[PDB]
């Protein structure tokens, strides 16, 4: 309907991060007669200028296009300076940090759930023929112990250690290259938020990948799941599963593990 939001309904709280345009805050959106809603608020430092402001607001319009359980939904915008983008809060924060500290509290079944949930989101985006370009555990947020979501697409934006070979060599970015990225993210999750190619330099990654080196099997990851990953890492983009195939396969792998 109308995504314009009155500023007086928003109560800005603590900073939770930074993006290219300004800090990101959590906060509350209040409405007469209805419960308070937790939100995240992107602020923009340089919005007075029309060119920055139009770049900033284009990020809300990008999120406006999507409607899916496992992608953050846009709530509204405030267009009067300072300009703010209001999104839904995932109140448990970023996936990686969540995974490091909740290691002894989650099982393998939970981790495969996250991968299945992210795949539904990414298939959805594949059916809309949208190309993310920045899949990585660092860009996934936690709404509940059983619910993760792709974060704000604008806050997600070279991520050499996540990128397909064609992405690095030719700046080609397709749904197939998203499938590669997703496999690195899936590895990250079975690794509880460990980063790929820790200690390796960015300019050497493409060589190690050209030679055929691949991220190893994570401790206590089922072989059928790692098999799935290595297929996302096929050098030939044509031989990488589509997100619809990944969703179906992960659904089976989850069913078996639970
Ligand atoms: C403010 C200064 C600073 O150093 N901040 C870092 C830690 N301060 C802090 C946090 N951070 C934890 C945190 C992160 C995210 C969320 N939830 C949430 N829900 C919805 C959205 Cl759209 C976002 N977006 C977002 C926020 C930050 C970074 C990246 C994104 C994003 O979209 N990435 C793709 N976040 C809750 C808590 C905290 O609680 C602190 O204090």
Swiss-Prot record:
Residue ranges annotated for the Protein kinase domain, each copy included: 10-254
Active site residues of this protein: 134
Binding site for ATP: 16-22, 42, 88-90
PTM annotation: Phosphorylated on tyrosine residues upon activation, e.g. upon integrin signaling. Isoform 2 is phosphorylated on serine or threonine residues, but apparently not on tyrosine residues.
Subcellular location: Cell junction, Focal adhesion; Cell membrane; Cytoplasm, Perinuclear region; Cytoplasm, Cell cortex
Role, per record: Non-receptor protein-tyrosine kinase that plays an essential role in regulating cell migration, adhesion, spreading, reorganization of the actin cytoskeleton, formation and disassembly of focal adhesions and cell protrusions, cell cycle progression, cell proliferation and apoptosis. Required for early embryonic development, embryonic angiogenesis, normal cardiomyocyte migration and proliferation, and normal heart development. Regulates axon growth and neuronal cell migration, axon branching and synapse formation; required for normal development of the nervous system.
Complexes and interactors: Interacts with ARHGAP26, GRB7, DCC, PIK3R1, PXN and SRC. Interacts with the ARP2/3 complex.
Domain note: The C-terminal region is the site of focal adhesion targeting (FAT) sequence which mediates the localization of FAK1 to focal adhesions.
Protein's name in the database: Focal adhesion kinase 1
Organism whose genome encodes this protein: Gallus gallus (Chicken)
Lineage per the UniProt record: Eukaryota, Metazoa, Chordata, Craniata, Vertebrata
Name of the gene this protein is made from: PTK2
Range covered out of full length: 413 to 684 of 1053
């Amino acid at each position: 309907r109308d995504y314009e939001i009155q500023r007086e309904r928003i109560e800005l709280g603590r900073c939770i991060g930074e993006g290219q345009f300004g800090d990101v805050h959590q906060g509350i959106y209040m409405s007469p007669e209805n419960p308070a809603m937790a939100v995240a608020i992107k602020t923009c430092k340089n919005c007075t200028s029309d060119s920055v402001r139009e770049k900033f607001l284009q990020e809300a319009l990008t999120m406006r296009q999507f409607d899916h359980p496992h992608i953050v939904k846009l709530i509204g915008v405030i267009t009067e300076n300072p300009v703010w983008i209001i999104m839904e809060l995932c109140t448990l924060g970023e996936l990686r940090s969540f995974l490091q500290v909740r290691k002894f509290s989650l099982d393998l079944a939970s981790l495969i759930l996250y991968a299945y949930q992210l795949s539904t989101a990414l298939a959805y985006l594949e059916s809309k023929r949208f190309v993310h370009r920045d899949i990585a555990a660092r860009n996934v947020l936690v709404s509940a112990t059983d619910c993760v979501k792709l974060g704000d697409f604008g806050l997600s934006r070279l991520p050499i250690k996540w990128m397909a070979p064609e992405s690095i060599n030719f700046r080609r970015f397709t749904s197939a290259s998203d499938v590669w990225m997703f496999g690195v993210c899936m590895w990250e999750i079975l690794m509880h938020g460990v980063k790929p190619f820790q200690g390796v330099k960015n300019n050497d990654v493409i060589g190690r990948i050209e030679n055929g080196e691949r991220l190893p099997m994570p401790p206590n990851c089922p072989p059928t799941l790692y098999s799935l990953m290595t297929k996302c890492w096929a050098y030939d983009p044509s031989r990488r599963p589509r997100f619809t195939e990944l969703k179906a396969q992960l659904s089976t792998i989850l069913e078996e593990e639970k």
